[PDB]
Ligand binder design. Structure first.
Ligand SMILES: *[C@@H]1O[C@H](CO)[C@@H](O[C@@H]2O[C@H](CO)[C@@H](O[C@@H]3O[C@H](CO[C@H]4O[C@H](CO[C@H]5O[C@H](CO)[C@@H](O)[C@H](O)[C@@H]5O)[C@@H](O)[C@H](O[C@H]5O[C@H](CO)[C@@H](O)[C@H](O)[C@@H]5O)[C@@H]4O)[C@@H](O)[C@H](O[C@H]4O[C@H](CO)[C@@H](O)[C@H](O)[C@@H]4O[C@H]4O[C@H](CO)[C@@H](O)[C@H](O)[C@@H]4O[C@H]4O[C@H](CO)[C@@H](O)[C@H](O)[C@@H]4O)[C@@H]3O)[C@H](O)[C@H]2NC(C)=O)[C@H](O)[C@H]1NC(C)=O
Ligand SMILES: *[C@@H]1O[C@H](CO)[C@@H](O[C@@H]2O[C@H](CO)[C@@H](O[C@@H]3O[C@H](CO[C@H]4O[C@H](CO)[C@@H](O)[C@H](O[C@H]5O[C@H](CO)[C@@H](O)[C@H](O)[C@@H]5O)[C@@H]4O)[C@@H](O)[C@H](O[C@H]4O[C@H](CO)[C@@H](O)[C@H](O)[C@@H]4O[C@H]4O[C@H](CO)[C@@H](O)[C@H](O)[C@@H]4O[C@H]4O[C@H](CO)[C@@H](O)[C@H](O)[C@@H]4O)[C@@H]3O)[C@H](O)[C@H]2NC(C)=O)[C@H](O)[C@H]1NC(C)=O
Ligand SMILES: *[C@@H]1O[C@H](CO)[C@@H](O[C@@H]2O[C@H](CO)[C@@H](O[C@@H]3O[C@H](CO[C@H]4O[C@H](CO[C@H]5O[C@H](CO)[C@@H](O)[C@H](O)[C@@H]5O[C@H]5O[C@H](CO)[C@@H](O)[C@H](O)[C@@H]5O)[C@@H](O)[C@H](O[C@H]5O[C@H](CO)[C@@H](O)[C@H](O)[C@@H]5O)[C@@H]4O)[C@@H](O)[C@H](O)[C@@H]3O)[C@H](O)[C@H]2NC(C)=O)[C@H](O)[C@H]1NC(C)=O
Ligand SMILES: *[C@@H]1O[C@H](CO)[C@@H](O[C@@H]2O[C@H](CO)[C@@H](O[C@@H]3O[C@H](CO[C@H]4O[C@H](CO[C@H]5O[C@H](CO)[C@@H](O)[C@H](O)[C@@H]5O[C@H]5O[C@H](CO)[C@@H](O)[C@H](O)[C@@H]5O)[C@@H](O)[C@H](O[C@H]5O[C@H](CO)[C@@H](O)[C@H](O)[C@@H]5O)[C@@H]4O)[C@@H](O)[C@H](O)[C@@H]3O)[C@H](O)[C@H]2NC(C)=O)[C@H](O)[C@H]1NC(C)=O
Ligand SMILES: *[C@@H]1O[C@H](CO)[C@@H](O[C@@H]2O[C@H](CO)[C@@H](O[C@@H]3O[C@H](CO)[C@@H](O)[C@H](O)[C@@H]3O)[C@H](O)[C@H]2NC(C)=O)[C@H](O)[C@H]1NC(C)=O
Ligand SMILES: *[C@@H]1O[C@H](CO)[C@@H](O[C@@H]2O[C@H](CO)[C@@H](O[C@@H]3O[C@H](CO)[C@@H](O)[C@H](O)[C@@H]3O)[C@H](O)[C@H]2NC(C)=O)[C@H](O)[C@H]1NC(C)=O
Ligand SMILES: *[C@@H]1O[C@H](CO)[C@@H](O[C@@H]2O[C@H](CO)[C@@H](O[C@@H]3O[C@H](CO)[C@@H](O)[C@H](O)[C@@H]3O)[C@H](O)[C@H]2NC(C)=O)[C@H](O)[C@H]1NC(C)=O
Ligand SMILES: *[C@@H]1O[C@H](CO)[C@@H](O[C@@H]2O[C@H](CO)[C@@H](O)[C@H](O)[C@H]2NC(C)=O)[C@H](O)[C@H]1NC(C)=O
Ligand SMILES: *[C@@H]1O[C@H](CO)[C@@H](O[C@@H]2O[C@H](CO)[C@@H](O)[C@H](O)[C@H]2NC(C)=O)[C@H](O)[C@H]1NC(C)=O
Ligand SMILES: *[C@@H]1O[C@H](CO)[C@@H](O)[C@H](O)[C@H]1NC(C)=O
Ligand SMILES: *[C@@H]1O[C@H](CO)[C@@H](O)[C@H](O)[C@H]1NC(C)=O
Ligand SMILES: *[C@@H]1O[C@H](CO)[C@@H](O)[C@H](O)[C@H]1NC(C)=O
Ligand SMILES: *[C@@H]1O[C@H](CO)[C@@H](O)[C@H](O)[C@H]1NC(C)=O
Ligand SMILES: *[C@@H]1O[C@H](CO)[C@@H](O)[C@H](O)[C@H]1NC(C)=O
Ligand SMILES: *[C@@H]1O[C@H](CO)[C@@H](O)[C@H](O)[C@H]1NC(C)=O
Ligand SMILES: *[C@@H]1O[C@H](CO)[C@@H](O)[C@H](O)[C@H]1NC(C)=O
Lengths: 451, 151, 98, 151, 151, 53, 43
């Protein structure tokens, strides 16, 4: 060569694995119509009409869904919005009065009719008011007299989420900041951890609907080729097995009761809403799904489950234990929070050598998402009846780590932690930091042979 | 043809160092203003509630990251300044190539390695390299001064 | 599934001992040690890696089906029973006495 | 006389394009530092309650707008960089004048139209123009590179 | 030797104006990025609570001062631009030395006074000086323009 | 009963504060500008003539 | 230093819940507390 010299370059194609505060993109038809309050969606920017992406040739980046901070960022965000949105809403702290509950006419007394005295907007009226509660939302005292108390009144701070707001899962994109970049795995069947092949750069992700369920994965994205199973390590029986369906199985659900709103004003400028009465028959909440579709879907799963395991026969089972949240398929349907008993969907043994399913559901109103510090939320009742339809897009399993002769290997509905809800979608992506400055030798001196 | 047509952000990530040497503007742009163009443009959508209820949860996520993007960008522009070459993209120095950094030859550097690949192999020395250019300027800055006195 | 060999395990303070452990599938290795009154004490958390308060004597050393834990220069605190752990499973274990 | 005396911010708003071509510094200055000089100077008035009670309602109004002014400013300085000319004020290119942008002649452009007036008549093409200069640099940036290899 | 070795931030505070004329990079660097290098590097310590509980009391202390550092820095870079010389460190002008500013001679200015000392003796005139360079550019900017018309 | 006690949240403004109407100017940010109509009789809507920054 | 620096006091409070006025007993320091009217048993 020649007298070679360092020469410096600004604008080189170089990045490093990184983490930094992302920001969100909204949707055009979402912002325009008011929908009143909805999460913190209003405070976002709007997503670009042109869904711009650039494919990266001759690159094979490494992705590992499990160690991905976008999900440690996602739930961080998701909790922050809720707390702040419920910051101004009505506090139910004085409603800790002794509830004199008679029952109404799965017949143990799920709906209960209770009375109690409260002071109104004004301190000169102790009004004996009567209201309705769910058997779960309430808890008795001493001997089972006619007396109950709210489920977590003594130990928590219950806050009535304002009815003006909505829990509708508006999709969301995580737009990356400047000098940074978010990469995508454009493969069909990606393991979750490992090297990628079809990689590309985007500004924001695809629309991530922040739905929160506890057992099945609803309204998410389907697999592209064939259903896939994803775990950190499968021997790690303390590790959630995420499944992603190819074909989404539609699941219809409903609270059949036509309810009436009743504003009891604790005041001064605020009231506590409850069901005044039930217009018509009294019925049970449930969720309908084709058992053909569901178990033919279970056929998809087992064959790809047998890939990670030995061809040994597989068995499914109901959850070993935990809060109603985990042990039951919990989700929001039209503003009310469900808890479907999923023994039916998970009770089967799949080896080698009609009708439909109706899952019973309980409605809770006093709930504590994210299991907070004596901080509970009372969802006011939604007027009338509600009926919603979700797409199961996948689910979460948990293996029983004590292999048996008969056995053989058991998988029950997981869903203790919430970080996987986001992993299930944010697996495709990763964040990097751009570093445009780079030095390299080429024969050229800094032109100072004369001055 | 190839150098006078479209490419795209970060397109030459797996292209040779020589190849990438044409598509700098692509990744030399949008380091800043990649987002300030888009933000200002998309944010003036008919909302009229930009920063309503004062600042919020997305309020800081942006500003904590807005204020980063510029100082991060101004850090590389401060290097261009302190190395005496803010012509950007490409700039020669008097600092010679210490083969202790990379014994390898010219032919293969520009036509086989890629920048992602290269900057790794040279990552550890960059600190010492960068400091050599700063002391290359100041030698020149005093040599300039000395001649300002006498003429 | 784990095969912790061998079993007798009685020697003097001025000696050296090596405990083996066998497995079919792969995994994350570990080791422990029981005492009079005390419960099992961790000494290895990956295989090569040591726990807190563990000198250079504790040598973990083999990439293969057989993995071993060596603790040269024996002492009086070393008496007790050890076990090899891999995930949910455990080793047969072995008791060393006076 | 006229070019060596006082004028004032935005004074040549209704002056010909040629006339305005002297009073750039006037409106090329204060794009930033028009306010940071005044802010820092006027804010150190004997108050001793700068940012008392932490941040307030005027707290964000400024910072949301302080942080804008710079990226807005750094956006135009990023263009000067990416067009290879941050000499500012005036800079020639190899990009020729596509008469499809404006068929009109030189004489009247600089001596009858004003910049406000002109930039309007040319507003729609600016996007295509600006992109031509970027591809003018990169042709030059590769042509530079090619010669760095062989000498 | 002395100009090609280490010195340190603000080392020539009590060194002659001539002496300091070598150690500019030292105090021309770190004006910005003196803290953004250190902040980004030290802040990515394994905490994972960067900006936890949203923003706090140290939250604004930094951002109110982060956003200052850059505009403060961009104010001096705006002067380099508006004086037509962002080569930095050292740059000549057509503006001659009005001895009304300082009747003193060359010999003692660079070899006896220090910059702290000097900028004081010249503090009052700096305003008038700085404004002379701006009007020095614009004379040149129009003289440039005039020649752009005819060729 | 107080005029809006039952239906609102009444808040006693501290006596330490004052409602005095201190004049105010809207200073514009950098890269922006605020223009004025320096005319005598301006309609309110329409073109101006004597304009300034 | 035997004027009653540590003091054992009682009082009725409503609990987490408005349906229990629990007569509770607690300890206080002579400085942390102040009497009312005639020095009864009341502070
Ligand atoms: C997975 O994805 C699936 C698919 O997305 C999810 O399933 C979806 O779930 C969401 C919510 O969970 C559902 O959206 C809500 O729908 C209800 C009911 O739908 C109404 O509209 C139907 C026809 O659509 C019409 O309206 C739409 C816009 O809504 C319009 O685009 C369209 O062109 C058409 O014009 C009706 O058929 C429907 O039933 C009616 O008819 C029945 C007989 O046919 C009768 O039995 C019913 O009683 C009813 O008369 C019904 O009218 C909407 O109510 C709801 O909108 C509420 O929320 C928004 C935001 O706050 C608000 O703007 C709305 O006005 C409304 O809120 C007020 O009105 C409610 C009554 O309409 C009332 O109950 C509320 O309390 C509230 O009242 C407040 O405001 C009023 C004034 O408005 C005030 O007077 C009160 O005092 C009070 O303050 C949503 O649109 C989707 O439908 C559903 N999709 C499917 C396919 O099932 C699934 O959940 C996902 N999975 C998971 C896990 O998330
Ligand atoms: C989660 O689950 C994971 C599984 O899904 C699990 O990961 C696996 O864990 C094991 C052990 O922890 C890893 O080690 C493996 O060990 C094999 C041992 O085989 C040697 O020893 C035998 C007995 O002594 C020998 O019989 C055998 O053959 C020799 O002897 C014969 C005697 O007759 C003779 O005939 C033969 O010809 C031969 O001479 C052998 O010597 C080892 O074989 C195994 O495979 C590696 O070697 C193969 C070639 O033999 C390669 O084809 C294969 O790809 C493996 O290569 C390793 O090294 C490559 C280059 O570095 C890498 O590209 C590979 O990924 C792999 O990397 C391992 O080694 C790296 C060394 O730096 C290390 O950095 C890596 O981290 C990795 O350990 C293999 O070494 C096994 O690698 C793990 N992964 C897989 C996919 O199995 C994990 O533990 C669980 N937990 C967690 C937290 O993840
Ligand atoms: C308010 O309401 C709450 C909740 O409803 C009440 O809480 C209970 O409080 C009492 C306080 O004393 C606790 O009682 C204890 O009971 C111990 C003995 O219990 C054993 O017998 C039970 C009898 O129930 C049988 O009969 C009824 C009908 O008569 C059936 O419905 C029921 O299913 C049982 O039928 C089976 O058994 C009979 C024989 O008894 C057979 O003939 C049948 O064919 C059936 O096979 C029984 O219910 C108990 O089961 C419990 O324990 C087993 C393990 O042994 C477990 O597997 C079950 O799941 C269940 O938990 C048990 O066999 C007694 O020894 C002790 O001293 C104490 O008195 C009681 O545990 C509390 N229950 C709960 C759920 O917390 C509360 O009483 C009530 N208060 C008021 C004022 O109303
Ligand atoms: C609740 O508890 C509080 C606080 O403990 C009580 O508050 C007192 O409230 C009463 C209300 O009436 C106030 O009483 C006033 O007293 C005026 C006269 O006081 C003069 O005499 C005092 C007598 O005390 C002496 O005797 C006792 C024992 O008997 C000794 O412990 C004490 O030290 C005194 O001994 C000296 O004096 C005697 C002669 O009296 C000698 O023989 C000894 O050898 C000692 O030399 C005395 O204590 C007063 O002193 C005060 O004033 C002097 C200045 O003159 C000052 O220097 C002292 O430091 C001290 O402050 C004083 O000489 C009376 O004229 C008036 O009308 C009123 O009645 C009393 O001031 C309150 N005390 C305080 C501290 O606020 C309250 O009473 C009690 N309530 C109940 C219901 O229990
Ligand atoms: C970085 O590069 C510089 C030159 O740009 C190196 O300085 C020079 O290094 C050589 C040793 O390689 C010095 O000695 C001479 O070496 C040759 C044979 O190698 C021999 O013929 C000579 O007689 C003499 O021994 C040379 O003096 C030295 N130059 C100066 C000005 O000091 C430097 O060593 C390189 N450093 C690294 C870390 O690569
Ligand atoms: C923008 O300007 C460029 C030149 O800087 C234009 O490219 C040139 O356009 C002419 C057509 O006007 C091409 O063809 C030649 O035209 C003349 C008569 O007009 C004729 O004598 C020639 O034989 C030939 O037909 C010319 O090849 C072309 N140059 C190149 C390198 O392609 C361009 O068309 C302009 N575009 C717009 C939108 O104004
Ligand atoms: C700053 O410096 C400029 C020159 O760069 C000064 O302008 C010149 O000032 C002299 C007066 O000192 C003007 O008059 C001439 O003076 C000499 C003797 O001093 C005499 O021989 C000549 O016949 C004439 O009287 C000269 O015309 C003037 N130049 C211009 C172009 O106006 C300026 O006065 C200095 N200002 C300060 C405040 O120092
Ligand atoms: C048919 O299913 C049986 C299980 O019912 C499979 O038997 C397993 O075979 C694997 C090896 O292929 C062993 O590791 C398991 O221990 C076996 N389990 C049982 C319960 O036998 C059998 O392999 C399957 N055969 C085919 C052709 O798929
Ligand atoms: C699988 O087969 C085994 C026998 O091979 C069954 O094991 C019995 O399990 C019960 C507990 O439910 C024990 O009390 C018995 O001692 C076990 N018997 C034997 C012979 O192991 C097991 O129940 C079978 N599992 C299923 C689901 O049928
Ligand atoms: C069910 O409970 C309600 C409570 O008011 C009562 O009026 C009704 O008679 C009960 N139903 C029957 C069938 O007894
Ligand atoms: C650089 O040196 C290493 C040994 O340190 C050698 O393996 C390699 O081939 C050398 N590269 C060239 C281009 O000579
Ligand atoms: C370039 O060549 C060197 C040896 O000549 C080799 O080590 C390196 O891996 C090559 N680069 C690529 C991308 O193959
Ligand atoms: C430019 O073209 C238009 C017609 O498209 C014509 O009216 C106008 O006079 C032309 N301008 C000049 C300067 O020729
Ligand atoms: C400049 O001249 C053109 C035609 O030659 C005309 O259309 C335009 O309005 C003139 N500008 C002004 C400010 O009058
Ligand atoms: C500058 O002028 C002052 C008087 O105004 C005088 O004392 C001083 O010595 C002069 N300096 C030189 C270098 O002549
Ligand atoms: C430099 O010399 C001048 C007079 O020639 C004197 O006033 C000044 O104090 C000297 N500077 C120092 C630092 O002594």
């Amino acid at each position: 060569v020649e007298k070679l010299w360092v020469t410096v370059y600004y604008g080189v194609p170089v990045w490093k694995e990184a983490t930094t505060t992302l920001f969100c993109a909204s949707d055009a038809k979402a912002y325009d119509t008011e929908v009143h309050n909805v999460w913190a969606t209003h405070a976002c920017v709007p997503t670009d009409p042109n869904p711009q992406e650039v494919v990266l040739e001759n690159v094979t980046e490494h992705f590992n869904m499990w160690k991905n901070n976008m999900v440690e960022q996602m739930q961080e965000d998701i909790i922050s919005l809720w707390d702040q949105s419920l910051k101004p809403c009505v506090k139910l702290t004085p409603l800790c009065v002794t509830l004199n509950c008679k029952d109404v006419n799965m017949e143990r007394g799920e709906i209960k009719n209770c009375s109690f005295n409260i002071t109104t907007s004004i301190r000169d009226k102790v009004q004996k008011e009567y209201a309705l509660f769910y058997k779960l939302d309430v808890v008795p005292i001493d001997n089972n007299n006619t007396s109950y108390r709210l489920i977590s009144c003594d130990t928590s701070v219950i806050t009535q989420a304002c009815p003006k707001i909505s829990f509708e899962p508006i999709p969301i994109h995580y737009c990356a900041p400047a000098g940074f970049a978010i990469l995508k795995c454009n493969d069909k069947t990606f393991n979750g951890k490992g090297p990628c092949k079809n990689v590309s750069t985007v500004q924001c992700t695809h629309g991530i609907r922040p739905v929160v369920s506890t057992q099945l994965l609803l309204n998410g994205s389907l697999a592209e080729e064939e259903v896939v199973i994803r775990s950190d390590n499968f021997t790690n029986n303390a590790k959630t097995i995420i499944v992603q369906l190819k074909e989404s199985v539609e699941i219809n659900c409903t609270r059949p009761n036509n309810n009436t709103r009743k504003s009891i004003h604790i005041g001064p400028g605020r009231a506590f809403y409850t069901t005044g009465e039930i217009i018509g028959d009294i019925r049970q909440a449930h969720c309908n799904i084709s058992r053909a579709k569901w178990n033919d879907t279970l056929k998809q799963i087992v064959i790809k489950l047998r890939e990670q395991f030995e061809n040994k026969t597989i068995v499914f089972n109901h959850s070993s234990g935990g809060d109603p949240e985990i042990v039951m398929h919990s989700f929001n349907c039209g503003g009310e929070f469900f808890y479907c008993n999923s023994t039916q969907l998970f009770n089967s043994t799949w080896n080698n050598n009609g009708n439909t399913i109706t899952l019973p559901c309980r409605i809770k109103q006093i709930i504590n998402m994210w299991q907070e510090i004596g901080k509970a939320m009372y969802a006011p009742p939604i007027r009338g009846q509600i009926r919603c339809s979700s797409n199961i897009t996948g689910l979460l399993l948990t293996r029983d780590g004590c292999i048996n002769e008969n056995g053989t290997e058991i998988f029950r509905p997981g869903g203790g932690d919430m970080r996987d809800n986001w992993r299930s979608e944010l697996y495709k992506y990763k964040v990097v930091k751009i570093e445009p400055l780079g030095v390299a030798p080429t024969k050229c001196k800094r032109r100072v042979v004369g001055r | 043809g190839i150098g006078a047509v479209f490419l795209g952000f970060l397109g030459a990530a797996g292209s040779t160092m020589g190849a990438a040497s044409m598509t700098l503007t692509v990744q030399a742009r949008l380091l800043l203003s990649g987002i300030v163009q888009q933000q200002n443009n998309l944010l003036r959508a008919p909302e009229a509630q930009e920063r309503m209820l004062q600042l919020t949860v997305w309020g800081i996520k942006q500003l904590q990251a807005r204020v980063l993007a510029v100082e991060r960008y101004l850090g590389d522009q401060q290097l261009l300044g302190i190395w005496g070459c803010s012509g950007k993209l490409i700039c020669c120095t008097a600092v010679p190539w210490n083969a202790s950094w990379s014994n390898k030859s010219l032919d293969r550097i520009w036509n086989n390695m890629t920048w992602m690949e290269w900057e790794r192999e040279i990552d550890n020395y960059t600190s010492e390299i960068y400091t050599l250019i700063e002391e290359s300027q100041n030698q020149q800055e005093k040599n300039e001064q000395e001649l300002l006195e006498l003429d | 599934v784990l095969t912790q060999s061998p079993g007798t395990l009685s020697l003097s303070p001025g000696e050296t001992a090596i405990i083996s452990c066998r497995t079919s599938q792969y995994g994350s290795l570990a080791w422990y040690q029981q005492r009079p009154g005390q419960a099992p004490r961790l000494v290895i958390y990956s295989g090569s890696t040591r726990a807190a308060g563990i000198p250079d004597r504790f040598s973990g050393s083999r990439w293969g089906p057989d993995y071993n834990l060596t603790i040269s220069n024996l002492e009086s605190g070393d008496f007790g029973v050890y076990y090899c752990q891999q995930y949910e499973f455990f080793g047969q274990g072995t008791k060393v006495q006076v």
